[PDB]
Amino acid sequence: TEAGLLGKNIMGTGFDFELFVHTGAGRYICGEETALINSLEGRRANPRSKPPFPATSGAWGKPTCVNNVETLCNVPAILANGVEWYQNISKSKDAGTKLMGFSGRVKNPGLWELPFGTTAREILEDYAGGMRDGLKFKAWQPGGAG
Amino acid sequence: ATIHVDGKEYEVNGADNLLEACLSLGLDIPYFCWHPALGSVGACRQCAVKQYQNAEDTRGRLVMSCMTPASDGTFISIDDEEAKQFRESVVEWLMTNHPHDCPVCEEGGNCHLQDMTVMTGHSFRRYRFTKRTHRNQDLGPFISHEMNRCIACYRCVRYYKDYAGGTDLGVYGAHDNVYFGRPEDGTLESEFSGNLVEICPTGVFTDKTHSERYNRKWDMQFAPSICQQCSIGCNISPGERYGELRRIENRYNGTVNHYFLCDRGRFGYGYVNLKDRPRQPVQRRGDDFITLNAEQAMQGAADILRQSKKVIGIGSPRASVESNFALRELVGEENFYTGIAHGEQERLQLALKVLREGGIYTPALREIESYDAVLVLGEDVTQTGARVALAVRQAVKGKAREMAAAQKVADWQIAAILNIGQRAKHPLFVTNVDDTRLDDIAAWTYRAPVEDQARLGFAIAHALDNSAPAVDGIEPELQSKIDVIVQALAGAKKPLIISGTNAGSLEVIQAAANVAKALKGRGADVGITMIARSVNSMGLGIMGGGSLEEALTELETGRADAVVVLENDLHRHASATRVNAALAKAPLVMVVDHQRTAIMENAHLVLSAASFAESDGTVINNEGRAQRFFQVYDPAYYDSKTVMLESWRWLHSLHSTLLSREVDWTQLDHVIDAVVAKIPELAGIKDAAPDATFRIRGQKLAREPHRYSGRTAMRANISVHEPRQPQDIDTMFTFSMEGNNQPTAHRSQVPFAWAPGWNSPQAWNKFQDEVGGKLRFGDPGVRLFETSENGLDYFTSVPARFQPQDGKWRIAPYYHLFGSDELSQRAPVFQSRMPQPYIKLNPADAAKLGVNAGTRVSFSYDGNTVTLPVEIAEGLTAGQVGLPMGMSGIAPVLAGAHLEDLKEA
Amino acid sequence: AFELSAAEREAIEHEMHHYEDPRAASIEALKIVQKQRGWVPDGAIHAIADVLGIPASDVEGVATFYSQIFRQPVGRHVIRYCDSVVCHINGYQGIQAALEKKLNIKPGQTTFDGRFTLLPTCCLGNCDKGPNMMIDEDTHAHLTPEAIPELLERYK
Ligand code: SF4
Ligand code: SF4
Ligand code: SF4
Ligand code: FES
Ligand code: FES
Ligand SMILES: [Ca+2]
């Protein structure tokens, strides 16, 4: 906002955009997009039935678009380097990179950025270092608790 | 639209969802969270059906029928094996935490959860773990709270908050610890909180007044009746057991009061069960009070009345049309007096003239919800005509309904509708002497004396149409508010103007008529609604007669030596000292009434009349609809010494004994025919209900359910010999279960809703043509008059502005839903709910008098000093003092009067 | 008797400036009152409702919906230990046993002197450095049952 990248008349375009940070109060269901909209409106975070989707009538009945942090972090690279660069990062159906990582009693529990189509063995072994000493593999969840 | 359910083709409304479409076709889908008046939310997940994509489809998909539109060419299955298993599983999940409470639960035998547990076929428990429990709250004297029985269907919060506009009920907590109640212990503040006992499908919210003298639904004797506690005319089902009025249930009327009553009509019935009611005719001889039977009372009264030179009759707006007519025929038309005051009668006749000569349609109570802008002039609707206030709230939410309909959102998708129309609402402009309960949704509230509210109405009418008389002396800020109201009213397709006689001002009604005429001249679809005071105020106004002041003048001058007072305490319409003097001077006072009133001390004869629960008759509501109410029980079934007859029966027998020295009692339809022959304006009351010869395939209409119990033991302590079943020669109903209460029976009067498998109030679905619509063969009740071809002229007499004169205090009426109606004060449960009576003062006037909040001030009206504490009313205009109308010692006739010598005691 | 302070009212009103509906500042108003007073007392619900122009039942439903808004009195320091799946694999049970041994209380209870309130909590988003705990504003990772008694004494 000090540098003029946010607020009124952003870089001479005349587009006005105001960005706020709304801190939550500790509930897992608030991550659901309609429950997120309900929580943003100061209500109990019950989800909503779709249709209508939030693109038609979301926050306060207005058109609303909800996106993840990583999607909006993938956006500027697309807008700065081009569509054809983003389509050619990985030779798979899913384009672009993705934050992947193995956690829980591994040698290197962390987070890395990998192209789509990376097999799960390379994340476990070539990046996380495999399992720890004296522990053998039993199971894995690919995308979180759900 | 065309749907195919289980291989059968049906034609349905495409705007409906699948659940209400299938319930209207007679199919049984279990459901909890959906209500016809509240819309669909998809919470309970009970209404699952299997939808197929095409006719040649085997897999399908489980969908919520309440959330799925009944579009053309739909294919669904209710009795699919997977759908049945899922519905049974949902019932089983609800049963895991449910308490073992049915024997000691007031909902037992009337429980929707019981019916859906049986309907899904779930009777085997495999859950073996602990059940969650909850502490209960104290919700006031009317609603009992038991949160263990909750199934978290969210119907209470949806009704109370979204529909009723209440604020003190909510849902708290989380995952399976969801709690439905108030944030703290205390009385539920909504005037329509009593509908929770029918909205809640379990026994969480129950009728505490019924729970005192509890009995099950199958043990009740029901009758279709009309609520007598104001002029709206809501259809009710009173239910009796062991000779006392046990409960008032909502009787569905798709035109009037569809699913909801107000708390005054639901809990104000306790005056029927009072022990001081007259049960036998009593004749006063010196200091002795001898008890007569009916024939001795008729003979003695006839002899004394025949000795008299002129007997006058004083009717009442409490009494039915037939009883007022019978009194009018007994004393003669020239000697009949309406029991209300001259100003009250003038306002009532003006309201009737506006309704049936103004050329503007008057809506029924259900039709009020379809209007686009509402102007309320003078009438505190929530305290005098509460169900009209609820309908006005629905009409206000109509704007969000239209905004969502513009985005192709179905009418049953209530969450999406409320999300689209966030805080936008249709314009509501209310005027009163102080703040109202409609102020939270009102676009503007005008707190002013009744002259200033009338002037605002006249100014609005002049700004809409310049042919109307103008108001001179309007401040520019008030002029800007007037222009806001005019722009909102002129842009409305269906404006509605609501006034009434409770403001105590003729000019307010005249201003409302002028606004309605100005809107009619612009081509708008304007409606007008007048709120009267009592259940048969409009019937007494149509019948006509002299005022109470003329009757008291006739008694005081000696031209009348006999007075017959019909169901009237006479102190609410005239000063008590004048009434007592005129009645003490009269050598014969005969009081026909069902309540122990103060004028019976001066009465030479007291006829023990029947209340509405023990009588049949017709009442005309505020919209001019004639409605028949039927007797619930025989008062003489248990106490054989009780001689308590209908008032028209008493007066007709008295007239017969006066004329021919012989006692003929009557039949009810005979009195109806006499009314429609003598008074042509009341000719519509013949078609309000069919006569006593009406049958359903040869059989009468049952008053009590098929499983009515204890028939050989309920009276066995008095005598082991069973008594003769009480005969009903008056109506088509029978005082037994030997009759018809089929949902498909061709009738409009339904005593109670029961269907096999549907024991709760959801059986009204079986009794309707479509669910949430009208009754299957029409709603009962017939409008007495049509809309007039031509209208009235503009009322030229614009009043001057209110001027506070020194030493005189204008009485501003403050009405209370619990305390202003005469008979509901007598109900013992209302005393804990009735507010303590104070006097309202402006801060400036209280500072001028040197009085604070709570100190006692004494004032004299009609030479009688009474003392009251003080509250400081900020919204009350200075020069006015606010008084609670209809309370003990404060008559409703005091509205618009003046006060002298009001000073600190 | 509850009375909102001037700083609390100013912060709440500035939060209502951020939204097109004043109801949307209810969670932040409850968090402001909780930050100022440790928890949300009974009169704070009615005070926040009066400031925001919404019913008190809505404020109470919001306050009882969210687990991080305390409607019961807590201690001067709130320990929130993660009991989710990755910290279960990394062994939060030893941490919980050490906390219950040192504080001599159960989860959901507070200490006798009002110093500590022990609470389980959902995943803290620090699963690669588990097990994790959150004392009042500081998150601690790589927890061991031996380091818990040392870590507790730095919160007086
Ligand atoms: S609410 Fe219904 S199912 Fe529950 S205890 Fe009462 S009668 Fe039984
Ligand atoms: S209290 Fe009754 S109406 Fe409210 S959610 Fe529970 S079961 Fe439904
Ligand atoms: S609005 Fe009037 S008629 Fe209807 S239930 Fe209430 S008191 Fe009775
Ligand atoms: S009635 Fe459809 S989910 Fe509740
Ligand atoms: S599982 Fe404990 S921090 Fe995520
Ligand atoms: Ca009868």
mmCIF file of N, CA and C and ligand atoms in Angstrom, chain C residues 82 84-87 122-127 132, ligand 5:
data_model
loop_
_atom_site.group_PDB
_atom_site.id
_atom_site.type_symbol
_atom_site.label_atom_id
_atom_site.label_comp_id
_atom_site.label_asym_id
_atom_site.label_seq_id
_atom_site.Cartn_x
_atom_site.Cartn_y
_atom_site.Cartn_z
ATOM 1 N N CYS C 82 -0.969 -30.371 20.293
ATOM 2 C CA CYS C 82 -1.558 -31.004 19.124
ATOM 3 C C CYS C 82 -1.794 -32.484 19.394
ATOM 4 N N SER C 84 -3.332 -34.446 16.817
ATOM 5 C CA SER C 84 -3.754 -34.923 15.510
ATOM 6 C C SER C 84 -2.849 -36.067 15.054
ATOM 7 N N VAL C 85 -3.016 -36.487 13.797
ATOM 8 C CA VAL C 85 -2.531 -37.795 13.362
ATOM 9 C C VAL C 85 -1.009 -37.811 13.214
ATOM 10 N N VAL C 86 -0.423 -36.746 12.661
ATOM 11 C CA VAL C 86 1.023 -36.729 12.454
ATOM 12 C C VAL C 86 1.755 -36.602 13.783
ATOM 13 N N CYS C 87 1.226 -35.796 14.701
ATOM 14 C CA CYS C 87 1.805 -35.732 16.035
ATOM 15 C C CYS C 87 1.485 -36.972 16.857
ATOM 16 N N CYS C 122 -6.373 -28.943 17.548
ATOM 17 C CA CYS C 122 -6.270 -29.559 16.233
ATOM 18 C C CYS C 122 -4.852 -29.378 15.694
ATOM 19 N N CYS C 123 -4.637 -29.806 14.452
ATOM 20 C CA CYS C 123 -3.316 -29.721 13.848
ATOM 21 C C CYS C 123 -2.887 -28.270 13.692
ATOM 22 N N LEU C 124 -1.659 -27.982 14.104
ATOM 23 C CA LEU C 124 -1.135 -26.626 14.125
ATOM 24 C C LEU C 124 -0.455 -26.230 12.825
ATOM 25 N N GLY C 125 -0.486 -27.088 11.811
ATOM 26 C CA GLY C 125 0.184 -26.782 10.564
ATOM 27 C C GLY C 125 1.690 -26.822 10.657
ATOM 28 N N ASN C 126 2.228 -27.612 11.578
ATOM 29 C CA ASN C 126 3.662 -27.790 11.769
ATOM 30 C C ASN C 126 3.982 -29.271 11.897
ATOM 31 N N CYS C 127 3.418 -30.069 10.991
ATOM 32 C CA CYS C 127 3.464 -31.519 11.122
ATOM 33 C C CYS C 127 4.834 -32.098 10.795
ATOM 34 N N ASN C 132 4.033 -30.855 18.249
ATOM 35 C CA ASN C 132 3.943 -29.413 18.401
ATOM 36 C C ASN C 132 2.997 -29.069 19.538
HETATM 37 S S1 FES D 5 -0.555 -33.049 13.093
HETATM 38 FE FE1 FES D 5 0.268 -31.856 14.749
HETATM 39 S S2 FES D 5 0.985 -30.014 13.780
HETATM 40 FE FE2 FES D 5 -0.120 -31.084 12.206
#
